[PDB]
Design a protein around this ligand. Structure first.
Ligand SMILES: CCCCC1C(=O)N(c2ccccc2)N(c2ccc(O)cc2)C1=O
Length: 578
């Protein structure tokens, strides 16, 4: 029995959590109650398998068990139409069907939260259903959320209420901690959505290189043969979590944590503090540990990779192992480089050996490779230096707007909502990285951008409208950022035509938070640029500056919100003039 295996290892608590998350991620539109029921029916069954390891179907794979369970509600096409088809399938892939049907942008209503007085009550009354509901909402809205981590976020979520409801000012104690979690959770999800994207669209060889480079940065002292071991295990963990095998992902992740703590002295010296605490905390800890100090006396890379005369020889023997060592050797001594720049250098190195080694005299050919690294390295450096300077003078809001105009002109076909979301995130790099020393700036900024950009790519892949996004997204994982930076302004785009409703005015905007107020303004700017791509430079103020004036004059007016229907007609008149 397998369900028995995972049960004994994870226990009742975690085993129940993970399955809920698994179910929540597959049927994101299915109600909380139903998931709970199935989860329990599924848990009960597990209990029997523990005792009798051959009872009913205890001999089955989680795939069949989980699959049939869900299919007891999926056949209801009137609710989950396209799902029923999945259930009519077999073993080899009644699952691939499910995996392929995860929605990255569910049509799930916004999740507003009740006053601090209700949450605390509902929490205290039933501490179990309260947390269960949390995971449900998160995992159903983030189908790729790294499960093992979600449990961690859960433990904290609980501790937030456990402490705050016992304060003097609950709203004061809670609200903050809750915001802090809402953010960190969205980040952790984006970060992980990339990892699954890598594996799924580029293959594991891609995810592996990324791991080697990142880990080598964190553990400089670690010897290649050790890193490789970590990368190999690490890969599987993530390979499982993305395919939807949550339980084994959680198991294997734990084992990896155990290992890394046992051989501490062989890996990093900053792992101590991590290995002295509760599993879940220990896992989240090592995963975000700072890089260890760089080994004192280290030889030069040119030695064994460009000057040696056996290069091509070794490259032919085990190219994969050779390049892996190159990356590892170049990354360990370069924690000031972004993971994607490292992977770019590596790719540039491999491409070179390929053409060079088949030459009349290799050494002479690949002798000046490091000369072609120089550009590759400086490009990001300048980009960062430039965009941080700007960010500094305009502030986040004004900076985001800039990027809004910019990207919209780059790929005008993209849907406004997406352009807005992406642009905003892209602007959050300023505050998140610009305040760092150049030594830590590049890895911070460019690797963050790889996350943001993938968001735009997955969202786009749903309904492809721009080949230019399709190209940059699909041609190279490591080159996406540079690929987008290279785009200027589409010369084939044909300006949209005005038709009121596209942007409706309902006075309802006077109640939304300050944030959703900016957002409505930005959504406007995008719509503007789509209607007047060319005519625009910084004359892109003549309307927004006035766009501001507009809003300021109808929420404060005593009129019944009519000005909104009338006035809105006056600014449109002035706008067109410019
Ligand atoms: C103590 C055992 C933890 C195993 C682990 C690890 O090393 N990284 C990890 C680190 C670098 C590259 C790839 C994976 N991730 C991880 C995943 C998502 C995330 O946002 C943070 C970290 C892991 O889950």
């Amino acid at each position: 029995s397998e369900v028995a295996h995972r049960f004994k290892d994870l226990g009742e608590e975690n085993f129940k959590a993970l399955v809920l998350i698994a179910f929540a991620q597959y049927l994101q539109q299915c109600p909380f109650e139903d998931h709970v029921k199935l989860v329990n029916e599924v848990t009960e069954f597990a209990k029997t398998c523990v005792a009798d390891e051959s009872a009913e179907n205890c001999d089955k794979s989680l795939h069949t068990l989980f699959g049939d369970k869900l299919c007891t509600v999926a056949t209801l096409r009137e609710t989950y139409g396209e799902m029923a088809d999945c259930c009519a399938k077999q073993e080899p892939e009644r699952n691939e069907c499910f995996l392929q049907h995860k929605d990255d942008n569910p049509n799930l209503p916004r999740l507003v939260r009740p006053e601090v007085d209700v949450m605390c009550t509902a929490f205290h009354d039933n501490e179990e259903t309260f947390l269960k509901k949390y995971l449900y909402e998160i995992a159903r809205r983030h189908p790729y959320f790294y499960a093992p981590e979600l449990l961690f976020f859960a433990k904290r979520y609980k501790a937030a209420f456990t402490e705050c409801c016992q304060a003097a000012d609950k709203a004061a104690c809670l609200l903050p901690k809750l915001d802090e979690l809402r953010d960190e959770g969205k980040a952790s999800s984006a970060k992980q959505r990339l990892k699954c994207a890598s594996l799924q669209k580029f293959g594991e060889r891609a995810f592996k290189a990324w791991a080697v480079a990142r880990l080598s940065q964190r553990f400089p002292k670690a010897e290649f043969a050790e890193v490789s071991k970590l990368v190999t295990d690490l890969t599987k963990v993530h390979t499982e979590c993305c395919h939807g095998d949550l339980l084994e992902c959680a198991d294997d992740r734990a084992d990896l944590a155990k290992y890394i703590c046992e051989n501490q002295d062989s890996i990093s010296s900053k792992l101590k503090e991590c290995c002295e605490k509760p599993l879940l905390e220990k896992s989240h800890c090592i995963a975000e540990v700072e890089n260890d100090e760089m080994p004192a006396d280290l030889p030069s890379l040119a030695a064994d990779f460009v000057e040696s005369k056996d290069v091509c020889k070794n490259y032919a023997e085990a190219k994969d192992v050779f390049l892996g060592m190159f990356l590892y050797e170049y990354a360990r001594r370069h924690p000031d480089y972004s993971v994607v720049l490292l992977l770019r250098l590596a790719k540039t190195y491999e491409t070179t050996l390929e053409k060079c080694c088949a030459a009349a005299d290799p050494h002479e050919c690949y002798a000046k490779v490091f000369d072609e690294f120089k550009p590759l390295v400086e490009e990001p450096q300048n980009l960062i230096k430039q965009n941080c300077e700007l960010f500094e003078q305009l502030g986040e809001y004004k900076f985001q707007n800039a990027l809004l105009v910019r990207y919209t002109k780059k790929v005008p076909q993209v849907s406004t909502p997406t352009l807005v979301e992406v642009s905003r995130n892209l602007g959050k790099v300023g505050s998140k990285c610009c305040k760092h020393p150049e030594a830590k700036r590049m890895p911070c900024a460019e690797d963050y951008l790889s996350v943001v950009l993938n968001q735009l790519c997955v969202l786009h892949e749903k309904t492809p409208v721009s080949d230019r996004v399709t190209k940059c997204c699909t041609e190279s994982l490591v080159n996406r950022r540079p690929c987008f930076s290279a785009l200027e302004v589409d010369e084939t785009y044909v300006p949209k035509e005005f038709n009121a409703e596209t942007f409706t005015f309902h006075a309802d905007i006077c109640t939304l938070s300050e944030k959703e107020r900016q957002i409505k303004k930005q959504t406007a700017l995008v719509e503007l640029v789509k209607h007047k791509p060319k005519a625009t430079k910084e004359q892109l103020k003549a309307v927004m500056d006035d766009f501001a004036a507009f809003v300021e004059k109808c929420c404060k007016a005593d009129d019944k919100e009519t000005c909104f229907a009338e006035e809105g007609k006056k600014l449109v008149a002035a706008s067109q003039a410019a």
